[PDB]
Amino acid sequence: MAKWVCKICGYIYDEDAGDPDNGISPGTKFEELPDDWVCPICGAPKSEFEKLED
Ligand SMILES: [Fe+2]
């Protein structure tokens, strides 16, 4: 699946990894993250992520 970078801090939201410590199972697409999910490192909103693809 896809990876996304937090443009603030460099955390990678890896869709294959999810974010289970914060309620997100492995395999959850970025679009499906709740609107108020934030970067688990720096707290940035979803708007601050960029998908790592051309
Ligand atoms: Fe971040």
Side-chain angles (χ1 to χ4, degrees):
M1 305 185 71
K3 296 90 184 79
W4 299 65
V5 65
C6 176
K7 300 175 303 159
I8 308 296
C9 79
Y11 170 80
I12 305 294
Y13 180 72
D14 180 357
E15 290 176 349
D16 292 296
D19 184 16
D21 292 0
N22 299 289
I24 307 295
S25 53
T28 302
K29 287 182 147 55
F30 185 83
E31 286 77 8
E32 295 302 318
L33 297 173
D35 289 348
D36 62 342
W37 177 97
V38 299
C39 179
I41 308 308
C42 76
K46 285 185 74 182
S47 65
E48 303 312 281
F49 284 74
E50 164 181 318
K51 194 180 186 173
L52 297 179
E53 68 179 15
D54 183 63

